[PDB]
Amino acid sequence: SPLPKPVLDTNGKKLNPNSSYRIISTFWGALGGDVYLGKSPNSDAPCPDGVFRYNSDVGPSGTPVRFIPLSGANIFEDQLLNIQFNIPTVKLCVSYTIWKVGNINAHLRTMLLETGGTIGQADSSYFKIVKSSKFGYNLLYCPLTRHFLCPFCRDDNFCAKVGVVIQNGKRRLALVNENPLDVLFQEVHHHHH
Amino acid sequence: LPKPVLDTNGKKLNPNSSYRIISTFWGALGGDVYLGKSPNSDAPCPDGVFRYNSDVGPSGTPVRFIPLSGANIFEDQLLNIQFNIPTVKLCVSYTIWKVGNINAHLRTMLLETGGTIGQADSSYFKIVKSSKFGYNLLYCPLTRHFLCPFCRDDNFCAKVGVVIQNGKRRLALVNENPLDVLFQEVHHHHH
């Protein structure tokens, strides 16, 4: 009966797949800090492959992303999509703009958000944007493994909340069971270039 | 004849292209140039030019080069430098490289953003061949030229290097220990 709800940016405008957004926190000062593309020191990837957020807002602004809906050209709450850092790269690092979820990390006891994924394929990592119970939105990761293996055997609509774990003194985005990261979407675009 | 500046693929630098400014070192001494902020900065936007403390970590912030005159980027010719990134409207000037005032704690001028392009108050840089592999950036103040055009050595340019500020590598004027850099072309691959 109800039609879906568009996700809005910080200016109140509907999210557009043709636009670029920073994923920013609802925090300030030492607790603020936008999402960015980084690398853990013990990664064996050839390119930065880690989704982090800065340790405070006193530093760089975040890495811009675009949102690629699984189907259609709108971006609604509770809609599967891929997330990709929308940045110029070298040719061999293109896949390391595309968000994915890594394997279970033994030490931190969860899966970390990484890049190196695909877009729009059965092996792609799909996320959803949902309204937070406080300000802004949460990201959810929705594995489609059972779905693609048996398209509708039975439907377990399982998604996991995206939060932060501290890794080598840095805020690493990761799957959490409680306290998801509250985020807003800040549109950015080029002026001149 | 003017000599084109080359990127790491051997192609002439193009004002229509974007480049990361990367180190000639590998590992702990590596680390690309990026747009950051120091504490104690009252700026409304990130306003500091840094480079990463190693090359394990993020990649650098892309820049474009804007010649003061003409359509080509040559060695030893004045240009402005600008981080070539999307921003909010408030922070557009804070993509444009400038050189700040003397920093009392470090007794040199630090590289900042917040500048202008193509004007008499813009910060002009030159790219020159390093005595080692790669290139150096020089800052060429117009101060003496405007204040005393027939004084000596008004074309003095200071080499850009790095000073440590709050545990970070901050680009700054360091005339006798320049940062050797290379230019790594990057572009979008939307499909």
Side-chain angles (χ1 to χ4, degrees), chain A residues 1-192, chain B residues 1-190:
Chain A
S1 150
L3 287 159
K5 193 153 199 313
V7 182
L8 308 182
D9 64 25
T10 59
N11 292 317
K13 302 183 254 85
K14 309 172 180 179
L15 288 206
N16 185 335
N18 296 322
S19 301
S20 293
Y21 305 88
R22 296 193 188 117
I23 301 172
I24 72 172
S25 80
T26 61
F27 290 118
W28 300 69
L31 274 159
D34 300 352
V35 171
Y36 71 96
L37 172 58
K39 194 175 190 181
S40 166
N42 313 296
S43 162
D44 201 64
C47 311
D49 67 332
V51 181
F52 295 83
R53 78 178 190 98
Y54 289 112
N55 278 5
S56 77
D57 52 26
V58 189
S61 289
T63 311
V65 300
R66 59 174 185 166
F67 301 96
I68 307 108
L70 186 147
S71 173
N74 285 336
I75 296 164
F76 290 109
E77 293 181 12
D78 193 41
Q79 172 180 15
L80 294 174
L81 43 78
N82 303 124
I83 303 173
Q84 176 182 29
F85 288 117
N86 193 22
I87 59 171
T89 70
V90 301
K91 311 183 220 42
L92 282 174
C93 294
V94 177
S95 69
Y96 290 99
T97 59
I98 302 166
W99 290 30
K100 62 172 277 177
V101 175
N103 298 318
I104 299 204
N105 186 284
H107 178 47
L108 300 144
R109 310 156 36 88
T110 188
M111 291 154 90
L112 311 180
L113 266 60
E114 302 175 351
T115 62
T118 57
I119 289 165
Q121 293 175 356
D123 62 353
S124 296
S125 305
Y126 295 92
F127 301 85
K128 300 193 306 198
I129 307 171
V130 299
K131 186 63 194 61
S132 173
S133 58
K134 299 199 187 199
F135 283 95
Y137 300 95
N138 305 134
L139 310 175
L140 306 183
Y141 165 60
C142 304
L144 292 186
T145 294
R146 284 187 43 179
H147 169 72
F148 284 121
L149 291 173
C150 188
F152 179 28
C153 263
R154 196 187 88 100
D155 259 356
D156 180 40
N157 310 314
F158 171 75
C159 304
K161 296 173 266 285
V162 174
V164 162
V165 293
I166 299 310
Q167 179 194 41
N168 313 288
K170 297 179 183 301
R171 298 171 174 164
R172 178 66 182 271
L173 269 70
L175 304 189
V176 300
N177 295 318
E178 280 173 0
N179 296 136
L181 180 67
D182 293 334
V183 302
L184 301 159
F185 304 113
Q186 180 183 56
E187 197 267 354
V188 293
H189 55 269
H190 287 270
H191 302 76
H192 276 358
Chain B
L1 291 143
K3 196 180 181 162
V5 183
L6 305 182
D7 64 26
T8 54
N9 298 322
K11 192 61 221 83
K12 299 143 72 147
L13 291 200
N14 185 335
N16 299 329
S17 295
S18 313
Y19 305 88
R20 298 176 186 143
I21 300 170
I22 70 170
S23 178
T24 64
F25 293 111
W26 192 18
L29 294 181
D32 299 355
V33 169
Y34 73 96
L35 171 57
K37 202 176 192 179
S38 157
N40 312 151
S41 172
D42 39 13
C45 307
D47 68 334
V49 179
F50 294 85
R51 80 177 188 102
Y52 287 113
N53 282 356
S54 84
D55 65 12
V56 312
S59 308
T61 309
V63 305
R64 64 171 186 174
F65 299 96
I66 308 164
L68 177 53
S69 176
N72 292 291
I73 295 159
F74 292 122
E75 288 182 12
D76 199 31
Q77 293 199 353
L78 299 179
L79 48 76
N80 304 117
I81 306 174
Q82 180 182 24
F83 289 118
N84 195 19
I85 57 174
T87 70
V88 300
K89 185 161 142 292
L90 179 70
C91 294
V92 176
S93 71
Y94 289 99
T95 61
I96 298 167
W97 290 31
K98 61 173 276 171
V99 172
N101 300 319
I102 292 167
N103 181 284
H105 194 56
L106 302 166
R107 290 195 183 185
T108 189
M109 298 164 152
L110 316 180
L111 268 62
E112 303 172 350
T113 64
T116 63
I117 291 161
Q119 300 172 39
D121 62 358
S122 306
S123 296
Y124 294 95
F125 299 88
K126 290 180 166 175
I127 303 170
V128 298
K129 177 69 190 78
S130 177
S131 64
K132 299 181 174 68
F133 194 75
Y135 297 97
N136 297 320
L137 309 176
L138 309 187
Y139 165 58
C140 297
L142 310 184
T143 306
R144 263 176 96 103
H145 168 70
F146 288 149
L147 296 191
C148 187
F150 294 100
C151 277
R152 248 79 157 154
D153 195 37
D154 285 3
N155 64 343
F156 164 71
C157 303
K159 309 195 208 294
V160 174
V162 167
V163 299
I164 302 309
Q165 178 193 46
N166 313 108
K168 300 190 236 166
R169 292 170 178 166
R170 178 70 181 267
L171 266 69
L173 303 184
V174 190
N175 196 44
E176 306 283 1
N177 187 25
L179 178 70
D180 295 331
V181 299
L182 303 166
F183 307 108
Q184 181 176 77
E185 201 270 351
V186 292
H187 59 265
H188 283 274
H189 302 76
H190 293 303

